[PDB]
């Protein structure tokens, strides 16, 4: 199904997930297909890149994602994992470049700011099979994977903005009225809030 997608301001969105379930035999949750059915067809019809699953209120640490430029050419470019464990390079300290490091979130909904990224990242878990997946990539794939993890650990890229682009975002989040719980916008709905 499409669901809402939550926004900043929602606790759900603000606090670290809980691991999804694996049995000592290696079995998964029998209904955790439904779920990520569900997190496909929002993040589909939110013509997202990425999509986390407490964006959709569900405090579980999983994210699927549809995501070609700059993936490790072992990487599907469309797949789900569970229990993502996450590595980078160097995260840098630096001031983000205004014209390569824009990002957004359909979480933060119509906004984007300059967000400093390591250049490389690899997450490890399972896939929807219960097997081991590990995928990695630079650049948009790798600002995805530390995205994605970010609202699994109970973060918004907003968390990690500095200087002049902490200011304009906290400007902007105020000025909609966000920051506060019960906030939502449903693709398919709600018209795209990214002009796509
Ligand atoms: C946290 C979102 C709930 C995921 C759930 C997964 N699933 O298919 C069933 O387990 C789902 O899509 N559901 C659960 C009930 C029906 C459908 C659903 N939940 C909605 C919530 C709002 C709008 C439409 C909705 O459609
Ligand atoms: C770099 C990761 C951006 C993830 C975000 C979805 N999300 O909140 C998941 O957690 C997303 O797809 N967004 C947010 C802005 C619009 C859309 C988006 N970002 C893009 C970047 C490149 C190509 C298509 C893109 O579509
Ligand atoms: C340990 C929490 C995970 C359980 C459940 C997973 N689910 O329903 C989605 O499939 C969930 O997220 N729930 C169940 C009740 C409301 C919601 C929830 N759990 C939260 C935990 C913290 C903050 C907000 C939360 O919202
Ligand atoms: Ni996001």
Redesign the pocket.
Known sequence: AVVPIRIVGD??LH?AT?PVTVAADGSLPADLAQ?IATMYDTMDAANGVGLA?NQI????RLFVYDCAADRAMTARRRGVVINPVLETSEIPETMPDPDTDDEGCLSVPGESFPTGRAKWARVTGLDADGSPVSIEGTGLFARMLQHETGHLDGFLYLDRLIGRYARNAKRAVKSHGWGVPGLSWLPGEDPDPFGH
């Open positions: 606790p759900v606090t809980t779920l699953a209120g569900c405090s579980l």
